[PDB]
């Protein structure tokens, strides 16, 4: 789908989404194409109409460079998004580690970002269930309990786990929280179960 | 009583007049409530259909 020079092989995410007139059901769009084909004076005339519409798409479709959240190959590519919908993951030749190459996970495995199961509010345990609570109360409780165990049991009674899914800066801040704020060296990431050897 | 001509007018403050003017516009919307409601429904369909996004993009780009 990436290397195909036309729409012959395309991502289902692009179908009916990229264009302004591509949402029109094929039942109505097919006669429109047949009408236009018959009417057509020249290719350059209707190519100009198509170019103006192509230019307009820049209002809707947002193309953003990202680095794959999955494995260590480090594939970078552009995400084409109309609102919150991912239309297609468009690889670029300039991508230093992968070029135009992708696997099913980086090319098509991004549904989780829009999953209805995505956590959108902090949860504070209230007995046998989780209570949806404001960010302030969740942060205030973490500060109150972390300070409580640090005073009564010491800074070394608090461990911190960094995610190798998260960024370099997020790893740096987790260890700066553990060492510079809490005062412990209890930091680690999934590399422990992985390439520590 | 004796003849007098001088009239001390009642103070219509800037904020008081602003409320009067806004309330006059509110009353006009209330009177044309059905027409506004119908315009909004029509506008909502222009957005559902290709129309409003197409115009937003035509002027945007
Ligand atoms: C082409 C139809 C244009 C309709 C113009 C509608 C103007 C709406 C005015 C809204 C006034 C709000 C009243 C207020 O804020 O107190
Ligand atoms: C009525 C609600 C808005 C629908 C769009 C109408 C504006 C179209 C542009 C007309 C102004 C112009 O370019 O002369
Ligand atoms: C004044 C607003 C109510 C009149 C609505 C105008 C009807 C046409 C809307 C624009 C359609 C278009 O430009 O394609
Ligand atoms: S943009 Fe035109 S030339 Fe390119 S795939 Fe679509 S119909 Fe074919
Ligand atoms: S696209 Fe596939 S190979 Fe490339 S980084 Fe993502 S998961 Fe790894
Ligand atoms: Na392609």
Swiss-Prot record, chain A:
Domain called 4Fe-4S Mo/W bis-MGD-type: residue spans: 61-117
Binding site for [4Fe-4S] cluster 4: 68, 71, 75, 103
Location of this fragment in the whole protein: 198 to 394 of 985
Domain of life of the source: Bacteria
Lineage of the species this protein comes from: Bacteria, Bacillati, Bacillota, Bacilli, Bacillales
Family that this chain belongs to: In the C-terminal section; belongs to the prokaryotic molybdopterin-containing oxidoreductase family.
Chain sites annotated for binding [4Fe-4S] cluster 2: 4
Protein name: Probable oxidoreductase YjgC
Gene: yjgC
Organism: Bacillus subtilis (strain 168)
From Swiss-Prot, chain B:
Record's protein name: Uncharacterized protein YjgD
Organism: Bacillus subtilis (strain 168)
Entire-sequence positions represented here: 2 to 62 of 186
